[PDB]
Design a protein around this ligand. Structure first.
Ligand SMILES: [Cl-]
Lengths: 210, 210
């Protein structure tokens, strides 16, 4: 099989800068008919793959002209000039010359923006869930950068997670932390605390509820 | 209007078979080949095979040929992928895509296959209520993936953050949030709409101010 090696694994880039992704095949991908069926696809979060480039260097209809492809034989490059926030996601090269057709490992393009402190919110169990017989306290940490963040759950002072992809609008991250416990254990405590420690602020961002 | 319509979610038992469909419309079905691509969380994209509806020829990735059969019915413009001898390793999102001249230009929406003996369980949908105000709904205790969430039947799209599901005790839990201006809620009603295709269930939860 033709192995497609993609570099880099992760590509952080500031808005307006250029970006380059490389793809190297373990053997030539020149078809018998003389064509090189090397394609580039973009997988945006929650969407089906999108064709960007076909036959090494040909831009697919509707693709912005800031995308370009080049290369030959075994070495190929996807170039993005003046990166925009809508460009984030996972880029794949693909060879369609030799069966079995094979994809590269993927490159996750991430937008590098200014550091942003998360907006923290805490939510008690609703009435309906309480009737059911469980108790979930929900904490949203929305619109922060960069992705790394710490969350701590404390019940009455004593200690006790889902990450979104990067947002295509403002290049921020969001995270949800859900503390699940029994209704009986929930009824016998008072204060519930969700602490958010981020690279932005020195002091933790605490949100509690009675 | 070229469209490849799949089905969002299939659940199948270990050792059984499943036959997934890709209904093409908007073009001459026999003139393009239909390919199948597998996306398993930690394995990139994998090409499964293609079927040429004009000739009837199906080409297979030899790694899956003993568990895969591709067919096409021109009279209904539908391509099919049948997987046999299913294992948990086969759980993944599967796409169909058409191609002829410029690679994979149109793609199906993807079909999430889960291989498990567990029963289908619809989610419980709970409202999450408290300048800018964040609301949400908690989609708890469902199986299998996926669920889709909109707000106000899709009319409320800006300011939404839907979080990936977490698996605990063999059930999935997801949360979605929407941030709104205070002057509109609860004057203008806000409803979270949840769909669980595997159980064919839809739930509309109004977020009451209390
Ligand atoms: Cl094509």
């Amino acid at each position: 099989d033709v192995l497609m090696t993609q570099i880099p694994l992760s590509l952080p880039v500031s808005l307006g800068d250029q970006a380059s992704i490389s793809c190297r095949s373990s053997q030539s991908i020149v078809h018998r008919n003389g064509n090189t069926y090397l394609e580039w696809y973009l997988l945006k979060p929650g969407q089906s793959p999108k064709l960007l480039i076909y036959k090494v260097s040909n831009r697919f209809s509707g693709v912005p002209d800031r995308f370009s492809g080049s290369g030959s034989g075994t070495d190929f490059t996807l170039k993005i000039s003046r990166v925009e926030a809508e460009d984030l996601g996972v880029y794949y090269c693909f060879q369609g010359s030799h069966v079995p057709y094979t994809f590269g490992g993927g490159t996750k393009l991430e937008i590098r923006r200014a550091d942003a402190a998360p907006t923290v919110s805490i939510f008690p169990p609703s009435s309906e869930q309480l009737t059911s017989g469980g108790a979930s306290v929900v904490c949203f940490l929305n619109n922060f950068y960069p992705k790394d963040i710490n969350v701590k759950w404390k019940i009455d002072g004593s200690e006790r997670n889902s990450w979104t992809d990067q947002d295509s609008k403002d290049s921020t991250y969001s995270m949800s932390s859900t503390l699940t416990l029994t209704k009986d254990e929930y009824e016998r405590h008072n204060s519930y605390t969700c602490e958010a420690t981020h690279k932005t602020s020195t002091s933790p961002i605490v949100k509690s509820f009675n | 209007q070229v469209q490849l319509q799949q089905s969002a979610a299939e659940l199948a038992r270990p050792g059984a078979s499943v036959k997934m469909s890709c209904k093409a419309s908007g073009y001459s079905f026999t003139t393009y080949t239909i390919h199948w691509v597998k996306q398993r969380p930690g394995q990139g994209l994998e090409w499964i095979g293609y079927i040429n509806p004009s000739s009837g020829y199906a080409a297979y990735n030899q790694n899956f040929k003993d568990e895969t059969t591709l067919t096409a019915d021109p009279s209904s413009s539908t391509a099919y992928m049948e997987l046999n001898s299913l294992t948990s390793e086969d759980s993944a999102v599967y796409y169909c895509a058409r191609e002829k001249f410029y690679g994979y230009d149109y793609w199906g929406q993807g079909a999430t296959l889960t291989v498990s003996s567990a029963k289908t369980t619809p989610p419980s949908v709970y409202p999450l209520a408290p300048s800018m105000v964040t609301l949400g709904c908690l989609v708890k205790g469902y199986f299998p993936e996926p669920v889709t969430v909109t707000w106000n039947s899709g009319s409320l799209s800006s300011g939404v953050h839907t979080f990936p599901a977490v698996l605990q005790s063999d059930l999935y839990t997801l949360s979605s949030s929407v941030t709104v201006p205070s002057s509109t809620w609860p004057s203008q009603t806000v409803t979270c709409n949840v769909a669980h295709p595997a159980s064919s269930t839809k739930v509309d939860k109004k977020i009451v101010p209390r």
